[PDB]
Amino acid sequence: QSIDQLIKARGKVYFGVATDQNRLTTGKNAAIIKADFGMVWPENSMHWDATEPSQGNFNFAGADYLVNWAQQNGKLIGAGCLVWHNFLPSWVSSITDKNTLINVMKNHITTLMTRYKGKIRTWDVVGEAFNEDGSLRQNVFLNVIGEDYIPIAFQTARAADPNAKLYIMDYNLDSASYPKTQAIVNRVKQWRAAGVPIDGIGSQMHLSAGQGAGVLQALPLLASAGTPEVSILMLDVAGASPTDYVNVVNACLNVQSCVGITVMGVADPDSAFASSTPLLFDGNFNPKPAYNAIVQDLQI
Ligand SMILES: O=[N+]([O-])c1ccc2nn[nH]c2c1
């Protein structure tokens, strides 16, 4: 059975997965995505160092392949992350002039979103902007532009493609009592009250064993910021316990504004954390206990 069709039957938008061209052309990934998933995200091909490795030199072959394959196979597309400190080329993190970095950020955002205008459901515009204590992360954008970079990024993205849902995403938002979780909620409330167009919060759920249960309290706390949507992104669970996975799926089902869930790849050997066997399909592309548990859960 298809977890995407089953989750749609429960009123959600999608069950999605990260992928890219060389997964689609190898293994059984294309077959499984076609059958079982409803949305795809670029695993690496929308990283800043993948798409703009030197200033104004844009590389879109990888992302084009993903977008075209998704359109051909009737899948939704999410993409990101436009502004974050990861996968940033040196040419960007060596900029010290505020106006230059603002326009470099804006051109990166606008060029990518314009190319795929109207084809992308969800864009992750700002990522990993928070420290663990809830203060803003001192990345090049904060250091050179200041805290206005976040409103600027979102405004720029809304202008480039007003059809896209625009998200802020972060990790370690998996416990309701953790400072980072309350902090992103507080800032997103205040940004939106000021007119900043943040449509969603995305929770990057790279989980340890037993952390699924806590998401049942954390996800509702995130939804309390009042964004139109929240989502679960980058999901994997060390050990891939059925209990952990079913708890995360149920958190999504419990939160009205949660639109769907994206897993961090299809089969275990293609995970960055392969030793931890954290995904829903094994090295022979068979559905694992966690996949079948999700099916059972989704089937007062
Ligand atoms: O949910 N995802 O797996 C995922 C993967 C890569 C991304 N880049 N921006 N947002 C992302 C989400």
18 CA: nearest ligand 1 atom: 3
- Interstrand relation of 165-171 and 39-42 (parallel, antiparallel or unpaired): unpaired
Nominal resolution (angstroms): 1.4
Structural determination approach: X-ray
For a ligand 1 pocket test, name from 262, 270, 271 the mutation site with the most ligand atoms within 8 angstroms of its C-beta. 262
Quote the domain boundaries for residue 249. Answer: 1-300
Cα of 127 from ligand 1 centre, angstroms: 10
Describe the crossing of helices 242-254 and 212-223 by its angle, rounded to 10 degrees.
Answer: 20
- b/e code 116-145 from CB counts within 10 Å (16+ = b): beebbbbbbbbbbbbeeebebbebbbbebb
- Separation CA 236–CA 231 (nearest Å): 14
Q: Measuring CA to CA, how many Å separate 184 from each of 78, 142, 217, 221, 261? A: 21, 16, 15, 10, 20
Strand partners, 233: 204
Tokens describing residue 33? 């995505």
261 φ, ψ (degrees, to nearest 5): -135, 135
47 CA: nearest ligand 1 atom: 8
Q: Are the beta carbons of 124 and 136 closer than 8 angstroms?
A: no
Instruction: Please report, as a single letter, which amino acid is at residue 279.
Output: L
Tokens describing residue 54? 């030197």
Cα of 147 from ligand 1 centre, angstroms: 23
Q: Are the beta carbons of 203 and 114 closer than 8 angstroms?
A: no
Kindly report the three-state secondary structure assignment for every residue of the chain: CCHHHHHHHCCCCEEEEEECHHHHCCCCHHHHHHHHCCEEEECCCCCHHHHCCECCECCCHHHHHHHHHHHHCCCEEEEEEEECCCCCCHHHHCCCCHHHHHHHHHHHHHHHHHHCCCCCCEEEEEECCECCCCCECCCHHHHHHCCCHHHHHHHHHHHHCCCCEEEEEEECCCCCCCHHHHHHHHHHHHHHHCCCCCCEEEEEEEECCCCHHHHHHHHHHHHCCCCCEEEEEEEEECCCCHHHHHHHHHHHHHCCCEEEEEECCCEHHHCCCHHHCCCCECCCCCECHHHHHHHHHHCC
Q: Are the beta carbons of 206 and 172 closer than 8 angstroms?
A: no
Whose C-alpha lies nearest to ligand 1, atom 9?
80
Other CB atoms within 10 Å distance of the CB of residue 111:
15
For a ligand 1 pocket test, name from 233, 258, 259 the mutation site with the most ligand atoms within 8 angstroms of its C-beta. 233
294: left (phi over 0), alpha (psi -120 to 50) or beta: alpha
232 CA: nearest ligand 1 atom: 1
Cα of 203 from ligand 1 centre, angstroms: 10
229 φ, ψ (degrees, to nearest 5): -135, 155
Overall domain count for the chain = 1
CATH of the domain at 260: 3.20.20.80
CB-based pocket (< 6 A), ligand 1: 18, 41, 80-81, 124, 169, 233-234, 262, 264
